[PDB]
Write an enzyme that holds these catalytic residues in place. Structure first.
Site, mmCIF file in Angstrom:
data_model
loop_
_atom_site.group_PDB
_atom_site.id
_atom_site.type_symbol
_atom_site.label_atom_id
_atom_site.label_comp_id
_atom_site.label_asym_id
_atom_site.label_seq_id
_atom_site.Cartn_x
_atom_site.Cartn_y
_atom_site.Cartn_z
ATOM 1 N N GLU A 11 -4.392 -1.328 -3.819
ATOM 2 C CA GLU A 11 -2.986 -1.652 -4.060
ATOM 3 C C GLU A 11 -1.995 -1.064 -3.069
ATOM 4 O O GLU A 11 -0.898 -1.576 -2.936
ATOM 5 C CB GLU A 11 -2.587 -1.215 -5.483
ATOM 6 C CG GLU A 11 -3.441 -1.889 -6.532
ATOM 7 C CD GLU A 11 -3.125 -3.339 -6.755
ATOM 8 O OE1 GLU A 11 -2.082 -3.759 -6.123
ATOM 9 O OE2 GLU A 11 -3.773 -4.032 -7.473
ATOM 10 N N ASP A 20 4.513 -8.848 -4.537
ATOM 11 C CA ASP A 20 3.073 -8.794 -4.410
ATOM 12 C C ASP A 20 2.537 -10.040 -3.653
ATOM 13 O O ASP A 20 3.318 -10.842 -3.156
ATOM 14 C CB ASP A 20 2.367 -8.482 -5.723
ATOM 15 C CG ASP A 20 2.342 -9.602 -6.753
ATOM 16 O OD1 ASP A 20 2.825 -10.721 -6.369
ATOM 17 O OD2 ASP A 20 1.903 -9.489 -7.857
#
Ligand SMILES: [Cl-]
Ligand SMILES: [Cl-]
Length: 162
Positions: A11, A20
């Site tokens: 991440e 994202d």
């Protein structure tokens, strides 16, 4: 290597709101804020999550705190899930981390949708499970991360992360 270091590699860490891979507002270590297109709706979710007026920026400690909650929540959601629990219980420590990673990324409902791959994992048919897991939007949209997770299920080692 452990679940936290694995997810931290997958991440990254960002201290300012960002979008994202799917275009959704996120912050910290993969902490989804909202799927809504509004940046204000994201700043508002963010302040509510942190407990202060953040103006879209958080500290390292605050990111890590959200991270700890999200990992805990992923684990708890797997154990409460009638479909996921038996899979999780059947796996060794390493592969359990692989499953937590997929739940953290796509949510318990999404993972619980990989019916055939779960059956294969439970049966310990590693090579077959790896092939089935790759036939997915998940693998096609985020191939490098997917390959790392898939290799973890296939080998039961942290090789893809070292
Ligand atoms: Cl939250
Ligand atoms: Cl990727």
């Amino acid at each position: 290597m452990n679940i936290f270091e694995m997810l931290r590699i997958d991440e990254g860490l960002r201290l300012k709101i960002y979008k994202d891979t799917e275009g959704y507002y996120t912050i910290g270590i993969g902490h989804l804020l909202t799927k809504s297109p509004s940046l204000n709706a994201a700043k508002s979710e963010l302040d509510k999550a942190i407990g202060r007026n953040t103006n879209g920026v958080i500290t390292k400690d605050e990111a890590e705190k959200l991270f700890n909650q999200d990992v805990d929540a992923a684990v708890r959601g797997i154990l409460r899930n009638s479909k996921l629990k038996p899979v999780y219980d059947s796996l060794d420590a390493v592969r359990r981390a692989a499953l937590i990673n997929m739940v953290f990324q796509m949510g318990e409902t999404g993972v619980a949708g990989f019916t055939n791959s779960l059956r294969m994992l439970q049966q310990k048919r590693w090579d077959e499970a790896a092939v089935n897991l790759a036939k997915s939007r998940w693998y096609n949209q985020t191939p490098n991360r997917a390959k790392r997770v898939i290799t973890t299920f296939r080998t039961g080692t942290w090789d893809a992360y070292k």
